[PDB]
Amino acid sequence: TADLSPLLEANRKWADECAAKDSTYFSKVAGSQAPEYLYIGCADSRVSPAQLFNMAPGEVFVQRNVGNLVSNKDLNCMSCLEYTVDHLKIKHILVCGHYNCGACKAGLVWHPKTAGVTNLWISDVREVRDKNAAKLHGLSADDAWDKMVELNVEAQVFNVCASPIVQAAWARGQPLSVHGIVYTPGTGLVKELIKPITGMEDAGALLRADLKQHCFFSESLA
Amino acid sequence: TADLSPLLEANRKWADECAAKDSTYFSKVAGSQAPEYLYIGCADSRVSPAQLFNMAPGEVFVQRNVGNLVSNKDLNCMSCLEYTVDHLKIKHILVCGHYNCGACKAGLVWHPKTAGVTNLWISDVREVRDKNAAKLHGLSADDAWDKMVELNVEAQVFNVCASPIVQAAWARGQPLSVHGIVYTPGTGLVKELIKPITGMEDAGALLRADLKQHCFFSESLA
Amino acid sequence: TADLSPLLEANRKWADECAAKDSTYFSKVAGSQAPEYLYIGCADSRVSPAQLFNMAPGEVFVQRNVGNLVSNKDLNCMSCLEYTVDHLKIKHILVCGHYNCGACKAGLVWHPKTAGVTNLWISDVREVRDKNAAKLHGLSADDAWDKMVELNVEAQVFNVCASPIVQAAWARGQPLSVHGIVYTPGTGLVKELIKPITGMEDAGALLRADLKQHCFFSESLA
Amino acid sequence: TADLSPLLEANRKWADECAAKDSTYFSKVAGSQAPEYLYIGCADSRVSPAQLFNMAPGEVFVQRNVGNLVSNKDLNCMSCLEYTVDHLKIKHILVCGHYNCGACKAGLVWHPKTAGVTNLWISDVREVRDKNAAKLHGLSADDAWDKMVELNVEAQVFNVCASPIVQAAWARGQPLSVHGIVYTPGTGLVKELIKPITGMEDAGALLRADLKQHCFFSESLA
Ligand SMILES: [Zn+2]
Ligand SMILES: [Zn+2]
Ligand SMILES: [Zn+2]
Ligand SMILES: [Zn+2]
């Protein structure tokens, strides 16, 4: 019962359906790729980018990790961002959270003495949490969970915008836009939490934290 | 223009159908997930695992990084592995490489002096190449590329097998299998490179590196 | 010339003396170590902990990195912390910053777009600065630098306190203290910035961030 | 007894002795540093660089970690190397192992199912180990341990030489030399395992592995 035959038969059928309808569906992407989109999202099994957006092969380059986290000192995620931006010249970066996310739950409730690598990994969710005690405390377990997801989404858009890669791209006039969205596993629909950000002006109007003070910090000293 | 209306409209259209076909498609995965698979794959825009295996929401938990790499020392990949194995209790790990992989070509032709984070990330790929330098010795460019891909899939499978998370599940008598697969962007077809590995003895029959030696080295001293 | 003879000659001279003073200086630490201290400090060439505390061989176990930084997600620092606490059974952790620290100045004046790995590594330093933006607001260059150093020492001490290794030793009733110190390259003098922390209650009295909140957040939901 | 008074009194006395003998000992390094040496070595409490070499403040910038490891995807160690080479323009890099090293022991004998971050961290020692089964198997526990230390030293010189930083420096004609040495805790003496390496020619003559094939790999393809 460790056998893959059923699973290989599903893939075979799918590939045949696809090319029967469009002969160059796969052929036209045999030898290179040029997607317009990068998507950064959760490793959760209910949130499948290509299928929920209906995008075909060669349309969306994807990073996927527990909690949809972005950090300058994570060479895994930073690699997806640098390769898309600097070598494929993508136009749009999608940063996506989901309701009912258990990486955000563990962030609310786990004691940091918890054994294992997952507890190390979701340290980033604790940091967003600890900054928003005023939006979180004394809500129902349910209302706190949905609000944790939204805040993290906002946290990770800022991280993408404040990243060295995306900062160098905007400095050399490359058009690049960043987007904060959220998915509902219960209904399969996407909602837009934050409108499009295409540079320092949009960022300055749409994000809670101050990206400009972040980038130019000694223009606030003496 | 970075307008999202077109993408959202495609998600609308997508959700309505899936539901009209089947009323409970989404609502039954409202409040939890219990997938049976973990997929570790490449970040490239042509290899979409839920799409290419035709899997419904909540069927396959996903890690996706430049080059489908697995190291004990990468907390991003290691948490995907710990969460599925230890808490979700999955049964099958899919380790997937792909033909035409730009990460594997970078591993053959870049000089380690190249700037930027992607050059750091693919060091694992240079190490597989060096240990196997002789196998890649007189091949045409295309032939070294296809070989690199396949050698990388075998290594990554040994890495999952040798990981502390996995050695631990085996010693506890957890049922958990590991499978080396490859994908062709040009055809949409999955091929199987290494048959199922369900414990230490399959790993002895199937892998070219010695998993027993790695696990029990110190016994071969006096 | 890269000849090593001069350096080796200085080690010869050094060893002979220490031994002539005291026959068993070296031979008694031939086959094990049991130090009582762990030092986490900066990599800068002026801050040499065994020298500046005048400690003999086997007295102080050392971590040294650009900016004396501590994150749950850095396996280099975290193993120094786990090995001493869990296996060597140490009693005191020294977390040491220094005046004139180029890492702390880089954290104030670099634009996150700057190339190279040192710019990634010091993100922890930008985050301490941002949370405390107001305290650093109208200071002269020298004054913001000295403040940055001191704020960084407090943060890093909270990081060691909040780590899973340390929370775990405390819950097991292990005696283990944590101490925030600073060093002046110009004088050779150590000053003490935060008094000893020996458990949860000292941490409540001594740190400006709330360690209890961080550990038990989820209790303040309904 | 968690009290630091005795320890602060030792530092005070030391600093006074030093400046009594030489008035500018500390003063001349109050406002910057310019060391000639970087040292990369073990966090072991018996191996204290500044004291074993008799170097004063401002002479040796130091990285220290469990096992004296160097990896392109360790931002901690890679930071020490990039800062010294590119901003301070050091001339000499010292890579140092020690006999009786317990990071190298754990590498010989631990089962990789072992819980904790230290076991993740010393994965690099397993990789050097697995490549040298022919130098290691059927030696006494003691003889295998000393040989593990020597090999690792060689492993980590190669890693320094093959690093992006040191590769870019040599390409722009910066003089920089790499040195493989070993210390004996039992006798306090240093020994030279590998003679000085100042570029690709020296590396090519003195190192077991092929640095040239490593850097220029497609000049061995067709
Ligand atoms: Zn999630
Ligand atoms: Zn690929
Ligand atoms: Zn410093
Ligand atoms: Zn050691």
Domains of chain D: which residue ranges? 1-222
Separation between Cα atoms, residue A10 and residue A8, nearest integer Å: 6
Q: Which of A111, A127, A162 sits opposite C112 (nearest CB)?
A: A162
- Local structure of B64: helix, strand or coil: strand
Separation between Cα atoms, residue A54 and residue A50, nearest integer Å: 6
Return the ligand number nearest the Cα of C42. 3
Report CA(D68)–ligand 4 centroid distance (Å).
Answer: 7
Return the ligand number nearest the Cα of A43. 1
- Indicate the helix (H) or strand (E) that contains B38: strand B37-42
Separation between Cα atoms, residue D129 and residue D151, nearest integer Å: 8
Task: Say yes or no for a CB contact (<8 Å) between B168 and D113.
Answer: yes
Separation between Cα atoms, residue D60 and residue D179, nearest integer Å: 14
* Closest to C199 measured CA to CA, from C165, C164, C174: C174
Give the contacts of D75 (CB within 8 A, at least 6 positions apart): A73, A75, C74, C117, C120, C121
Separation between Cα atoms, residue D199 and residue B188, nearest integer Å: 47
- Local structure of C163: helix, strand or coil: coil
Separation between Cα atoms, residue C55 and residue D56, nearest integer Å: 15
Region for A105 from its dihedrals, namely left if φ exceeds 0, alpha if ψ lies in -120 to 50, beta otherwise? alpha
- Please answer whether residues B123 and D73 qualify as being in contact, where contact means their C-beta atoms are separated by less than 8 angstroms: yes
Give the contacts of A69 (CB within 8 A, at least 6 positions apart): A77, A121, A124, A125, A156
- Report which residue type is found at D201: E
Helices (H), chain C: 5-21, 49-52, 75-82, 102-109, 117-121, 123-131, 141-161, 164-171, 200-206, 211-216
Give the contacts of C175 (CB within 8 A, at least 6 positions apart): C91, C198
Chain D contact set for C102 (CB, 8 A):
83
Task: Kindly write down the DSSP assignment for every residue of chain A, as one continuous string.
Answer: ----HHHHHHHHHHHHHHHHH-TTTTGGGSS----SEEEEEE--TT--HHHHHTPPTTSEEEEEETT----TT-HHHHHHHHIIIIIS--SEEEEEEETT-HHHHHHHH--TT--SHHHHHTHHHHHHHHT-HHHHTTS-HHHHHHHHHHHHHHHHHHHHHTSHHHHHHHHTT---EEEEEEE-TTT--EEEEEEEE-SHHHHHHH-SS-HHHHHS-GGG--
Chain C contact set for B115 (CB, 8 A):
115
Residue D182 tokens read as 């070993």
Q: Which of A77, A80, A96, A101 is catalytic?
A: A101
* Closest to D43 measured CA to CA, from D13, D65, D75: D65
Distance from the B120 Cα atom to the nearest Cα atom in chain C, whole angstroms: 10
What's the full length of chain A, in residues? 222
Active site annotation includes D98:
yes
D80 CB burial (10 A radius; 0-12, 13-18, 19+): buried
Separation between Cα atoms, residue D138 and residue C88, nearest integer Å: 30
- Local structure of C89: helix, strand or coil: coil
Neighbours of C141 (CB within 10 A): 12
Task: Say yes or no for a CB contact (<8 Å) between C130 and A214.
Answer: yes
This structure's resolution (Å) is 2.5
Task: Say yes or no for a CB contact (<8 Å) between A185 and B59.
Answer: no
Active site annotation includes D86:
no
Report CA(B152)–ligand 1 centroid distance (Å).
Answer: 29
Separation between Cα atoms, residue D120 and residue D173, nearest integer Å: 37
Chain A interface, mutation test: which of C113, C119, C163, C216, most A Cβ atoms within 10 Å?
C113
Report CA(C101)–ligand 3 centroid distance (Å).
Answer: 4
DSSP C1: -
Residue in chain D closest to C177 (alpha carbons) equals D2
Q: What are phi and psi of A137, to 5 degrees?
A: -60, 140
Give the contacts of C122 (CB within 8 A, at least 6 positions apart): C66, C67, C69, C103, C106, C107, C110
Residue D162 tokens read as 């093959």
- Report which residue type is found at A43: A
Neighbours of C136 (CB within 10 A): 19
Active site annotation includes B172:
no
Q: Which of D80, D92, D96, D98 is catalytic?
A: D98
Return the ligand number nearest the Cα of A98. 1
Residue in chain D closest to A75 (alpha carbons) equals D73
- Please answer whether residues D58 and B105 qualify as being in contact, where contact means their C-beta atoms are separated by less than 8 angstroms: no
Q: What are phi and psi of C189, to 5 degrees?
A: -100, 135
Separation between Cα atoms, residue D208 and residue B137, nearest integer Å: 19
Report CA(C141)–ligand 3 centroid distance (Å).
Answer: 17
Give the contacts of A182 (CB within 8 A, at least 6 positions apart): A96, A97, A98, A99, A149, A150, A153, A190, A191, A193
Residue C58 tokens read as 């086997």
Q: From the annotation, which residues of D make up the binding site?
A: 42, 44, 98, 101
- Report which residue type is found at B124: D
Task: Kindly write down the DSSP assignment for every residue of chain D, as one continuous string.
Answer: ----HHHHHHHHHHHHHHHHH-TTTTGGGSS----SEEEEEE--TT--HHHHHTPPTTSEEEEEETT----TT-HHHHHHHHIIIIIS--SEEEEEEETT-HHHHHHHH--TT--SHHHHHTHHHHHHHHT-HHHHTTS-HHHHHHHHHHHHHHHHHHHHHTSHHHHHHHHTT---EEEEEEE-TTT--EEEEEEEE-SHHHHHHH-SS-HHHHHS-GGG--
Task: Say yes or no for a CB contact (<8 Å) between B53 and A11.
Answer: yes
Report CA(B53)–ligand 2 centroid distance (Å).
Answer: 18
Q: Which of B57, B92, B120 sits opposite A185 (nearest CB)?
A: B57
Chain C interface, mutation test: which of D9, D45, D191, D198, most C Cβ atoms within 10 Å?
D45
Matching residue, tokens 């892998």: B207
Separation between Cα atoms, residue D37 and residue D34, nearest integer Å: 9
DSSP C53: T
- Indicate the helix (H) or strand (E) that contains B178: strand B177-183
Separation between Cα atoms, residue D83 and residue D165, nearest integer Å: 10
Separation between Cα atoms, residue B22 and residue B144, nearest integer Å: 47
DSSP C59: S
Active site annotation includes A42:
yes
Separation between Cα atoms, residue B38 and residue B90, nearest integer Å: 7
- Please answer whether residues D115 and A115 qualify as being in contact, where contact means their C-beta atoms are separated by less than 8 angstroms: yes
- Report which residue type is found at A87: H
Neighbours of D93 (CB within 10 A): 27
- Please answer whether residues D102 and D47 qualify as being in contact, where contact means their C-beta atoms are separated by less than 8 angstroms: no
Report CA(C53)–ligand 3 centroid distance (Å).
Answer: 18
Residue A65 C-alpha from the chain's centroid:
9
- Please answer whether residues C25 and C55 qualify as being in contact, where contact means their C-beta atoms are separated by less than 8 angstroms: no
Give the contacts of C73 (CB within 8 A, at least 6 positions apart): A71, A73, A74, A120, A121, A123, B75
Separation between Cα atoms, residue C123 and residue C134, nearest integer Å: 19
Report CA(C186)–ligand 3 centroid distance (Å).
Answer: 13
Beta bridge partners of C150: none
- Please answer whether residues C123 and A178 qualify as being in contact, where contact means their C-beta atoms are separated by less than 8 angstroms: no
Q: Which of C73, C162, C221 sits opposite A112 (nearest CB)?
A: C162
Longest dimension (CA), chain A: 70
* Closest to D64 measured CA to CA, from D48, D40, D47, D92: D40
CA distances from C116 to A48, A211, D122 (A): 34, 21, 26
How many CA atoms are closer than 13 Å to the CA of C155, on its beta-carbon side? Answer: 23
Chain D contact set for A75 (CB, 8 A):
73, 75
* Closest to B45 measured CA to CA, from A39, A53, A25: A39
Q: Which of D75, D115, D117 sits opposite A73 (nearest CB)?
A: D75
Chain B contact set for C117 (CB, 8 A):
120
Return the ligand number nearest the Cα of A185. 1
Give the contacts of A134 (CB within 8 A, at least 6 positions apart): none
Q: What are phi and psi of B159, to 5 degrees?
A: -70, -45
Burial A125-140 (b: 16+ CB within 10 A, else e): bbebbbebeeebeebe
How many CA atoms are closer than 13 Å to the CA of C100, on its beta-carbon side? Answer: 18
Cα dihedral sign, A44-A49-A53-A56: negative
CA distances from C21 to B218, C15, C17, C18, C117 (A): 40, 10, 6, 5, 45
DSSP B29: G
- What's the topology of domain D1-222? Beta-carbonic Anhydrase; Chain A (3.40.1050)
Angle of CA points A76, D71, A87, to nearest 5°: 40
A42 is an annotated ligand-binding site residue: yes
B130-137: long-range contacts (C-beta < 8 A, 24 or more apart)?
Answer: B130/D209, B130/D213, B130/D214, B131/D131, B133/D213, B133/D220, B136/B108, B136/D221, B137/D220, B137/D221
Separation between Cα atoms, residue A56 and residue A192, nearest integer Å: 22
Chain B contact set for D119 (CB, 8 A):
164
Chain B contact set for A76 (CB, 8 A):
65, 74, 76-77, 121
Separation between Cα atoms, residue A44 and residue A98, nearest integer Å: 9
Neighbours of D222 (CB within 10 A): 10
Give the contacts of B5 (CB within 8 A, at least 6 positions apart): none
- Please answer whether residues D85 and D178 qualify as being in contact, where contact means their C-beta atoms are separated by less than 8 angstroms: no
Residue D60 tokens read as 């040796």
Beta strands C37-42 and C60-65 are parallel
CA-derived radius of gyration, chain C: 20
Residue C1 tokens read as 């010339």
Separation between Cα atoms, residue D123 and residue B24, nearest integer Å: 47
Separation between Cα atoms, residue B129 and residue B151, nearest integer Å: 8
- Please answer whether residues A35 and B47 qualify as being in contact, where contact means their C-beta atoms are separated by less than 8 angstroms: no
- Please answer whether residues D104 and D149 qualify as being in contact, where contact means their C-beta atoms are separated by less than 8 angstroms: yes
Interface of B with C (CB under 8 A): 73, 75, 115, 117, 120
